[model samples]
Target chain A: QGYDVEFDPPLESKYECPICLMALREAVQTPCGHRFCKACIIKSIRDAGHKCPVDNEILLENQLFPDNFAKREILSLMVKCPNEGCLHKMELRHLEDHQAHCEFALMDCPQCQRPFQKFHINIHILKDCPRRQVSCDNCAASMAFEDKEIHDQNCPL
Target chain B: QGYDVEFDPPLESKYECPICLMALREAVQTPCGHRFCKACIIKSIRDAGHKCPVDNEILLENQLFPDNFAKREILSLMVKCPNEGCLHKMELRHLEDHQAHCEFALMDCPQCQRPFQKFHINIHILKDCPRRQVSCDNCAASMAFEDKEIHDQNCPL
Candidate 1:
């Protein structure tokens, strides 16, 4: 997913990182009173020549101290999910997890070729998907899908 | 606001407490394979007289193993948050915590008569919601509701 997303209320403008542009993670503050993700600032300093991107000074790297606190709060910004017909909105971090695994998202089952919705997979396998794979409860015979129920009826245990 | 919540595909039938008719909490299973919440069963045993609510038998208290594992997993049932404008659905346990503090549910701020949205009491006083409560940044002027900026303008540091 893309980082540094623009929020509706526009999230506090200063929290955005200059490099990646999303909310800062592992934030560090310079003596100049500007903050950025540690990774962003470090990569800028080491590879792109070390200077405060804010000014012309050759800055002391030690002046950059971590502000992990801001990262957590910013990452918690709420967002309305872009998924259609699914009214799921949550904190930014959880939003990724949900989008990564919402029921509306289709995924394949190794045993059953029928693709199942991610959230419903648990219930589908446990209860009814007619094509879901199962083994004989008594005979331990490996069976494919609906044939198992029929085998269960007369499998000599 | 309203409740009989049963899922369309049906969340495990075994998860429901016969007494409260809701998902079981602190559940316990009797020797008879019937389960009910421990508090519900204990109170039932005491108040409704010590007979199994489901069958005519003397239910053994010692035989009733605490089914906390099942309770936790079942309480982990996903539910659409009932709060208007929230659009968050989570496990039953987390749902309680979210409901207790979700921004959409209106509640009073302890510092001022202005209501605090359940979500951002943390940020409410920091920015926005002019009437929550705060201390002056330049001075130790602790103000409640609509007085911070007034105090900020002229409070002698």
Candidate 2:
């Protein structure tokens, strides 16, 4: 699996996987002085091809070792938030926190199961989601906020 | 806020927050050469104190700056999982993923809101929770699993 993200200042070509052509994730190095994403190279070899994608040198799956140095370097690189309209850039190490907090991040409302931007979810749930909970002013019974109008019309009170 | 987890090799005194006496989180440095959790320092100053806790040097809330170096170092250190019976340890940078995936981690059932260990949650929800969905064998109507007996007695089919 390669890191499928847009990096700030762009990543150096050395850190790229020759197979998937993305930033190497769970990086592995071949004996021929080449690196590729572990999963990408594994899949490549699984298809019965044994040559390095970059060098055409015969390679064995067992010769690939974890590239800890490359993995650490990749972790320290800067990457932009994947969320749309979010211009925030931080070291890849901090991207998880940023992604969770990014207001432009889209998520599903728990009540309605409809997607909304994280920042707007509260407003949508409170004012718009059909499944949002509300208490009846007449009978004090709880119901979905969107059903309030019909419930009010049929209220025994 | 301060990190409230145990470290593998234990953290150095330099990384300790003076106020919370724990690993610093969202760390900040005082002008007087001391560091504390950002929120801890803010709350200290807000409680009518205007001095550095270490030196009692006169200080202002605005003088505290983020201790980015300390924060990064803390993130790179190895910490044990907080879950019970789990001895997994990983760099603080990777702790969030570990916490989410840790088998011993406890969580609440969505329907019944009862807390159970992550590894046991599936079994509990499937076989035990009162709110678990079950289908009547005769009527083929869905009801809570715990209510199946009474529902069977009244099932029209």
Candidate 3:
């Protein structure tokens, strides 16, 4: 899978949300001079009743402002694709859509959660999967698996 | 990213092919009592004139029998999906197909060499990219990205 990976030279901590420790998702800036994921900040407000983790200021949902500028900046920063074969690089904002369809992306098949390339998944599921459930040629009983030989020898038809 | 993790209860070393030093791909067993990737062995024979690396025996292409039975058995074993958010389980035979579509697959974007999910690449390239080339909406001149704001303010148009 082409999931998250570290940058060669890491991104600054300022770009990250304090709560999630990843790049900000739905970023919000606090009047107390802090930033966090919108949900993180909201949860903090409810947990601490609007208390700023940074300073001792009471935070309110209304006081929090959408920090799209920061979010955009964070999203626009260049990042690498960590897939072994796919050497694509681009902005973080576009990462979700791109990685969803990247040819070189790795997948953990629901059937087996084993690693495979993005390009070959269709064939894997429909045609090549030995362990996947298949209708017994000799009988109507449905069976799952790689031991087709066992089915052949045991099934009476 | 929960993608790409180590396998516990490690696979047997006997399953490993000496040529690639990993589990076999398109595995073939030779009459010479050696096993290799079909391509690896084919290339070996061509490069060395039908010679066997293990016993230094004169090997023939016809002697290369498909160890598809072993391949299937090998493929039937369990392995880990290296993609993120995909802690799926599967036999090795199913690995290629499953991983191809794993959502958590990684891609290495150009600028930062930072790893990201394959899905989000489009947004990275089209909009949020900072290092990707951008044209001045006013001058039609190419300029550095994420810095387009500076040109926007200065542009006559």
Candidate 4:
């Protein structure tokens, strides 16, 4: 006698990316009927060239910006900072911006090209700028030009 | 040419604890006429044998719980969970309890003596309780005392 294996399908199949298969939090559908996370799709388009992963349909840049409010809300509810040490929760509206500069966001610094806290990005950029100047200790004035001479004699006290 | 030296006689002069000199948060006057932060004094009493730091006036074992509503409020605002991950803000009335058991509190597992998240305490206890037993799989029956073979076979399916 064969025992009937009772399989209970999940109440609902969560929307997921075809590539990552993780529960899609802000799912955006492509013109080719394949769906992906909005952020993921954006990144894939930039890095892998704009094409539907499932159907290889050539997707125009403009065709990709579909409004999926329901999916966006679901994504917002599941939103969390992907940073390893950060515990910020991101809303859908802010997800792109947040991930773009998330402390745990994995990206190269524009100036040093070294990985650093996304929050500290401005400081990183300023750290290496050729126009960046130090303040004179005594005068509290910008010292980009006077460097050593200012420190030696003309420094404000 | 004159040098303008604006000297304001060191603001206001009040005796303060050498350890935390900022006008003791909750100043408690000892028999020796020395004053200290109330909480600091209590902690000192608990740590060292009850004796005044200055003059060795046999510090009363029982602290003269000073009326420090304003000070307590201020201190409460300042008191935060010392745990690495916890960000709980607590007042004096609740500070000790919060420090002891806050989910973000850095406390050691009572059984394993290992540091664990307050949030994961239940899971940690479950992990440690090896002798822990539960009701029988078939019905609500204690599984600890009953013979496993007989109970498994004879128990109503």
Candidate 2 chain A: minimum summed lDDT over ten consecutive residues — where? A63-72
Name the lDDT value of residue B81 in candidate 3: 80
Candidate 4 regions off by >4 Å?
Answer: A1-157, B1-26, B30-33, B37-70, B73-77, B90-94, B106-116, B124-129, B138-157
For candidate 1, lDDT tens digit of each residue in A1-157? 1254445456665567867777787766565556678888888788777687867557667656555334555667876666555666678777778878676777676556677777777787767766666777677777667787678677688
Writing each residue's lDDT as its tens digit, candidate 3 over B31-106 gives 5557777887788888877877777889998877565434654666777786777888887656678777776788
Please report, as a residue range, the 10-residue window in candidate 1 chain A with the lowest summed lDDT: A1-10
Residue range B1-157, candidate 1, lDDT tens digits: 1123433346766567878777776766665556677878877788777777887468756546665435656666777766667777776666767777677887765555576667766576566665656677777667764776667777896
Name the top TM-score candidate.
2
- Per residue, candidate 2 scores C-alpha lDDT tens digits across B57-109 of 89899877666545777998999888999988889989998887889989999
True contacts kept of 4: 0.00
DockQ of each: 0.01, 0.01, 0.01, 0.01
Clash count (model 2, backbone only) = 0
Span of ten consecutive residues with least summed lDDT in model 3 chain A: A1-10
Question: What DockQ was computed for model 1?
Answer: 0.01
Interface RMSD of each: 23.2, 16.4, 28.5, 31.1
Model 1 lDDT, residue B26, Cα: 76
Q: Native-contact recovery for every candidate?
A: 0.00, 0.00, 0.00, 0.00
lDDT of 4 by residue, B1-157 (tens): 1111111222122323533554355545454445567766777777875887655667884534332322333343334556677666545456666666667765566655777677877886675543335468778776533255677788896
Compared with the true structure, model 4 gives a TM-score of 0.26
lDDT against the true structure, per candidate, is 0.66, 0.84, 0.70, 0.54
